[PDB]
Every structure is written in structure tokens, then in C-alpha cells.
């Protein structure tokens, strides 16, 4: 006794699914409307569809929804795995598939979930094995033919739905394709995963829904389980009264976020580590935070926001730090790729890499992309007359197509960062791609840089950061980081707070890696960009 | 294009057979400057593959086929670097040039872009259209986007305070302009157009 009741109540249901509202309701109605009343389909005089191809990233919850529908309806969930049914014996995997379909058609109208169909559907042309084509033909025979199916629906699951046969993706077999790929759904999953345990009273789920921006849904349960394990692990070192006042806290969730990092997603500061550049911080904060926080006002105005920002100037200025600081406050991801870390010697590999990065960008909205070394990627294609020139032309055309081509530009924030804007072609600087031409160029700013660098550091009341910043006279953020690193090395040498003599002995060994003629060139380029903006005034209508 | 040997041509054959099967069909080839590059001679493996792909395109658009309805639209920005075997009637017969918009065209572009945007009643766009030159549709889009951003700024700082984007918003947005296409790049297009003429 009791066991048969518990194993009935532990079953999953529609109350245990979160975020996939519209597709869950669509599958629910298209399954249950045949099962609740067939008189409606008798009156309308048509047969319902009998095939669902589910696609998306692995770990989303597709088989959980299929099991929930199979639990909420009087069906029989039979699970068929992809690599399990395939064997090396000739005529054995087809026999296993026929036996599974006969078992599904024998007892009751049931629901078949064949998982990982991409392993047993090699498109009949790219494969070399005969057994794969044989089981593909067995699947098309069991799904369509003379008296093929008698009141039974099959469900599939895959990650890449393009490597399936066009005969498999036909009507009657997989006639409905469901894309199970946000913050409110993640909060619903957190609420349904933290339902059977009293965690605390002062735990706020807003930070847990905003910081885990790249979690697919199957990692949230592992996160909560790891937190519940770590709480009992850290609360058992010393130990009726122990069971009272149990549960996880915010530091437990912070430790779960820190010890465990993988988000099962292929994705590569807080407004304080950057010093100076107040108007640049304000402009980036505006042009990033408004299309994320107020979509309804932008749909009321009926206009699409701007996307691309391009920075240029001397190296060691803080462009990557600015990109991280504008990415860190939103709930977006961050894909920071480098210039020469995508080019290959093969034919088509660089453009394939560009397509994969942009597909991974548009597969998770919103997402800011950080393209570095635009002078190394674009090269202002023009004419080179060579193999490297043709590869550069093809890379530039693929990049131009991915920025503004046959796309939807849902939520992609491309941010470029180069140190030579003269070697960029005038097609990426067109508005709509990289329209924001923000130039990133003092002692009052170096004070803020030293205050942002010395955030969590034991400081001396006798040191003067104004006296440190006054003797710079044209240093960079990299030079200030080198000075701070030398002071920290001298501090750890004196240990094995920061004192003033460490800075006094480290200020002499400065670098000043930037010369003067490159500064003259950058000022001449900025003056040319200022003089190109001509005959423009307040412009009274 | 593909990494391997003889696969970009299988790709071209597959897409064109798909087009011929599901006729009528419109195949939009974007940036022909990549695929349909002047064959000539490059003396390299990339040269060999980029010539094989062009030759496949020639035999697929005008070869031994049934002439079923398939309309190929090409869109390029360097038409001087395309094989003349493509630029010929039978494959791509008519070369339509789209210069920068004139005053009426740009005014119509602004009106089309603001089709679904609340605007002031007395704000005519003729002044902003006459007080510009050398611009493109993308540039007009940028000006409109900046005006919308200033209007949203005003709305947020007020917070239906400002239902309509106003003349001062548009003027402040137009205070800075893009000027995407420079004369250095435009004179080459003018030379190409007059050479074609």
C-alpha cells in the first residue's frame, strides 16, 4: 500500500511545465480534442494531424511536455531511443521498430516518443550504411502506407531539424514542427522547481531570474538540487530542533551559481569598473536599455531601434571593458570574439564560422556581440587580386549579409571595436549596421579609473590618487593597470594595506607605450569626421 | 560554399532543382560579388573552386533544361567584379541601377517610413527633405530613429504626456547626420552608370 498512490501523485502534469505556454497549449489542444470528443471531428469531417517534430537545444523540456500530456490523458507513453534501437545485426533494428509499433497499436490509443531522430535519419544520401536507410524506410512504412496508423500519434525530438529526410518531414508523418527554444518562463521554472521545499522568507527570485540568463531549463533543477545539497552539507559539520529553520539562502544560491558554471548553452563588472566617459556610458546605457525595458513604447511609436555601435581610437583605452559594462546590466548574453580567431586556410570555413556565431546570437534574444579587430576582419575589401583577397571579399559579404540581409533582426546588438577605422569598407559603416560612430579618446578621468581599479583594496589614508594621476600626462588604462599590478606585487612581496612607497617606487618604471604620431593620426581622423558633418545646424522647419 | 571538393556545386544543383520543381519560383541571389566573381585567372585552389562555382551557375541558369519559370534576382554592390557571362540576356538580362533618391523620392521614403508613426499635424517634411542632399534611405531611417529616441527620452523624463514626436525632436535629431555614401565612392558608380549608358 501507499506506493501505488505515491507513484500516481508524483506523475508530471500541465502544472509542471513553465514558459512554453503557447506551444504547450497547442499540443494540448491538438492531442486532447481527438481524445475528449471525436464528435467534433466527425461533424467537421476531417482527420486530425498525427505528427510533431520538436526541435531546439538539448535540455529544454520537450520529453517532459510529452510525458505530461501522456499523463494528463489516458494514453500509454512508450519511449523509443535513437541510438538504442540501432544495431549491427541485419534486419534487427527494423524488427525492433515493428515490434514497438505493434505494441503501441495493440493495447490502446497511445503516444509514441521517439527521441533523437537525427541519429537514425541520415537523409539517405550522405550516409554509407545500409541499415540506416533500411530503418528510415521502415519508419516511413510504419508511419504511412496501407492501414498504417489506427488512432495513434507519434512525437519526435531533435536538435538540428535540417538533417532529416524531406520524406520524413512530410504531411502525415511530421506535419507539425514545434520550435521549443525567457525571463518570465525562467521565473516560472524557478517557482515550480522550488515548490516542495521551504527555502526561506527573504529569497528574491528576481536576481535568480536575471543572473541565469543562459539556462535552458534542465539546469535550473540541477541548480536548485545543488543548492539544497550544499545547504545540508554546510549545515551538518557540527550537528527535533534540527529540522526546524531549514532551507537555502541567497548565499547558497550565489555559491551554486559560482561552483557550477555550465549553462548547457554555447555562449562565450557592474557599471563601476569603468572610469570616466560619462556621456559615452549614458549613450550606451540609453541605446541598450530602452529597447529591452520598453518594448511596448517602441511598438506604440512603431519604429525599430538602432543596433550597431563602433568604437575606435588608441589601444588600451577600455573598449572591451565598456562592452562588458553595457552587457552586464541587461539580461543578455555576451559573445566576444576576436578578429583573427575565425579565419582559416580552408574554403568556406570563415564564412561558416560567421554564420554559426550569428545563429548562436539570434538563437538567444537579447544578445550583444563583440566583434574585435574590424580592421583585421573587413580590410575594406576593394581589390586584392589573390586568394587571401577573395577570402576577405567572401568574409565581408557574409558578414554584411548577416548584419543586414534576409534576417528578422529580433534582438542583436553588434558592437565593433577597432584601432584603425580607415581600413573599413563603407558598407559596414552604413546606418543600420554600425551607425553609431563613437570615438573613445584625462587626469580627472584617471582619478575615476584609479577609483574603479581600487574598489576592494585595503587603502592607506596617506596616499594621494590626485598626486598619482597628476604625473601621468598621457598614460592609458593598461599603464594604470600595470602600475596597480606592480604595487600589488610589491605589497605581496612585503607581506611574504597598500603602502605609499610601493607606488613611489612603481611610478618611476612607467611605460607610456603609445607614441605621439598615432595620437596625431587619431585626432586628424576625428577632425575629418567632424568636418564631414557640414551644413548642419538647429535646422528650424 | 563548402569546405570539401565538389560540394558547393551539389548545393547549387539542389537549390536550383528545388526551384524548378516548385515553379514558379523567385531565387534571390544576394551579393553576387562573392559567388559570381570574374573567372579570369587567380592561380590558386580558391581560384579553381571560385571558377568551378561560376561555371556551375552558368550551366544551371542557361543549360540543358526545360525553361520552367524561375526568376533569378541578383543584388550586388560591385558589379564590375562579376563575370560578363552572367551579365547577359538569358541569365540576368536587365541591370537596374538605383541611385541616391532625389527630392521627391526621399520625401516619399520619409512618408513611407513614418506610415505607422504618430506625427504632428503642422509638421511638413518638405523642409527636412529640401535641407538635405547626398543621403540614402538608411540615412533617413537613422534620422527617424534618432527622432524617435529623443521623443522616448522626453516621454520617460515626463513620466500620455507626449503622444506625438515634435518638430524640436526632429530638429535635434537632424542636428547630426550620417552621410553614408561619400563622393569618392559615388563617383565610381557614376562612372559605371555612364559607361553602361
Amino acid at each position: 500500500n501507499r506506493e501505488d498512490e505515491e507513484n500516481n501523485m508524483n506523475e508530471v502534469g500541465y502544472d509542471d511545465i513553465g514558459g512554453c505556454r503557447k506551444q504547450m497549449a497547442q499540443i494540448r489542444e491538438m492531442v486532447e480534442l481527438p481524445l475528449r470528443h471525436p464528435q467534433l471531428f466527425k461533424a467537421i469531417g476531417i482527420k486530425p494531424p498525427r505528427g510533431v517534430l520538436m526541435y531546439g537545444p538539448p535540455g529544454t523540456g520537450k520529453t517532459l511536455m510529452a510525458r505530461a500530456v501522456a499523463n494528463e490523458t489516458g494514453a500509454f507513453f512508450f519511449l523509443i531511443n535513437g541510438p538504442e534501437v540501432m544495431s549491427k545485426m541485419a534486419g534487427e533494428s527494423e524488427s525492433n521498430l515493428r515490434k514497438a509499433f505493434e505494441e503501441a497499436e495493440k493495447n490502446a490509443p497511445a503516444i509514441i516518443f521517439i527521441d533523437e531522430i537525427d541519429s537514425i535519419a541520415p537523409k539517405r544520401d550522405k550516409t554509407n550504411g545500409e541499415v540506416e536507410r533500411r530503418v528510415v524506410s521502415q519508419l516511413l512504412t510504419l508511419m504511412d502506407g496501407m492501414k498504417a496508423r489506427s488512432n495513434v500519434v507519434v512525437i519526435a525530438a531533435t536538435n538540428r531539424p535540417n538533417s532529416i529526410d524531406p520524406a520524413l518531414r512530410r504531411f502525415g508523418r511530421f506535419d507539425r514542427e514545434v520550435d521549443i527554444g525567457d525571463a518570465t518562463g525562467r521565473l516560472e521554472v524557478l517557482r515550480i522547481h522550488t515548490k516542495n521545499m521551504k527555502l526561506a522568507d527573504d529569497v528574491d527570485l528576481e536576481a535568480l531570474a536575471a543572473e541565469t540568463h543562459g539556462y535552458v531549463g534542465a539546469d535550473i533543477a540541477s541548480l536548485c538540487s545543488e543548492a539544497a545539497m550544499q545547504q545540508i552539507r554546510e549545515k551538518m559539520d557540527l550537528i527535533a530542533e534540527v529540522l526546524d529553520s531549514l532551507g537555502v539562502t541567497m548565499d547558497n544560491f550565489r555559491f551554486a551559481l559560482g561552483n557550477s558554471n555550465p549553462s548547457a548553452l554555447r555562449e562565450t563588472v557592474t557599471w563601476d569598473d569603468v572610469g570616466g566617459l560619462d556621456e559615452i556610458k549614458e549613450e550606451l546605457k540609453e541605446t541598450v536599455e530602452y529597447p529591452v525595458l520598453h518594448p511596448d513604447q517602441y511598438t506604440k511609436f512603431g519604429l525599430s531601434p538602432s543596433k550597431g555601435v563602433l568604437f575606435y581610437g588608441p589601444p588600451g583605452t577600455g573598449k572591451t571593458l565598456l562592452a562588458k559594462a553595457v552587457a552586464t546590466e541587461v539580461s543578455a548574453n555576451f559573445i566576444s570574439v576576436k578578429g583573427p580567431e575565425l579565419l582559416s586556410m580552408w574554403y568556406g570555413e570563415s564564412e561558416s564560422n560567421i554564420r554559426d556565431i550569428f545563429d548562436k546570437a539570434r538563437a538567444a534574444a537579447p544578445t550583444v556581440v563583440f566583434l574585435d579587430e574590424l580592421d583585421s576582419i573587413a580590410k575594406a575589401r576593394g581589390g586584392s587580386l589573390g586568394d587571401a583577397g577573395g577570402a576577405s571579399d567572401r568574409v565581408v559579404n557574409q558578414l554584411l549579409t548577416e548584419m543586414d540581409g534576409m534576417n528578422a533582426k529580433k534582438n542583436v546588438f553588434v558592437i565593433g571595436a577597432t584601432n584603425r577605422p580607415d581600413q573599413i569598407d563603407p558598407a559596414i559603416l552604413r546606418p543600420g549596421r554600425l551607425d553609431q560612430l563613437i570615438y573613445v579618446p584625462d587626469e580627472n578621468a584617471r582619478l575615476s579609473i584609479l577609483n574603479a581599479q581600487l574598489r576592494k583594496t585595503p587603502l592607506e589614508p596617506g596616499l594621494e590618487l590626485t598626486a598619482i594621476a597628476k604625473a601621468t600626462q598621457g598614460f592609458s588604462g593598461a599603464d594604470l593597470l600595470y602600475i596597480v599590478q606592480r604595487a600589488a606585487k610589491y605589497a605581496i612581496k612585503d607581506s611574504i594595506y597598500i603602502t605609499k612607497e610601493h607606488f613611489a617606487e612603481a611610478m618611476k618604471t612607467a611605460k607610456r607605450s603609445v607614441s605621439d604620431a598615432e595620437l596625431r593620426r587619431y585626432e586628424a581622423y576625428s577632425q575629418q569626421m567632424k568636418a564631414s558633418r557640414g551644413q548642419f545646424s538647429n535646422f528650424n522647419f | 560554399l563548402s569546405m570539401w571538393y565538389g560540394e558547393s556545386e551539389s548545393n547549387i544543383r539542389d537549390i536550383f532543382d528545388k526551384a524548378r520543381a516548385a515553379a514558379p519560383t523567385v531565387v534571390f541571389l544576394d551579393e553576387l560579388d562573392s559567388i559570381a566573381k570574374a573567372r579570369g585567372g587567380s592561380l590558386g585552389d580558391a581560384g579553381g573552386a571560385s571558377d568551378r562555382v561560376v561555371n556551375q551557375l552558368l550551366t544551371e541558369m542557361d543549360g540543358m533544361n526545360a525553361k520552367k519559370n524561375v526568376f533569378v534576382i541578383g543584388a550586388t554592390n560591385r558589379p564590375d567584379q562579376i563575370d560578363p557571362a552572367i551579365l547577359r540576356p538569358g541569365r540576368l538580362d536587365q541591370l537596374i541601377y538605383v541611385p541616391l533618391p532625389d527630392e521627391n523620392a526621399r520625401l516619399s521614403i520619409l512618408n513611407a517610413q513614418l506610415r505607422k508613426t504618430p506625427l504632428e499635424p503642422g509638421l511638413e517634411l518638405t523642409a527636412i527633405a529640401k535641407a538635405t542632399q547626398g543621403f540614402s534611405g538608411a540615412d533617413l531611417l537613422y534620422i527617424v530613429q534618432r527622432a524617435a529616441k529623443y521623443a522616448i527620452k522626453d516621454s520617460i523624463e515626463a513620466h500620455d504626456p507626449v503622444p506625438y514626436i515634435t518638430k524640436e525632436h526632429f530638429a535635434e535629431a537632424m542636428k547630426t547626420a550620417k552621410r553614408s555614401v561619400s563622393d569618392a565612392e559615388l563617383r565610381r558608380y557614376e562612372a559605371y552608370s555612364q559607361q553602361m549608358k
Binding site: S344, A391 | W4, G44, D45, A46, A49
Partner: peptide, 23 residues
């Protein structure tokens, strides 16, 4: 009385492909 039986199932081979470089 008992009896024996013969069985010959399948085999698996390995192919070789050609690649194209861009210098």
C-alpha cells in the same frame, strides 16, 4: 534433439574524403 544454426550479420567500412584549401 538439439540443432545448430548459421548467422552472418553485416560489416562496417571506412571511407576517405578530399578537402579543398584556400591557400
Amino acid at each position: 534433439a538439439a540443432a545448430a544454426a548459421a548467422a552472418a550479420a553485416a560489416a562496417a567500412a571506412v571511407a576517405v574524403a578530399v578537402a579543398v584549401a584556400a591557400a
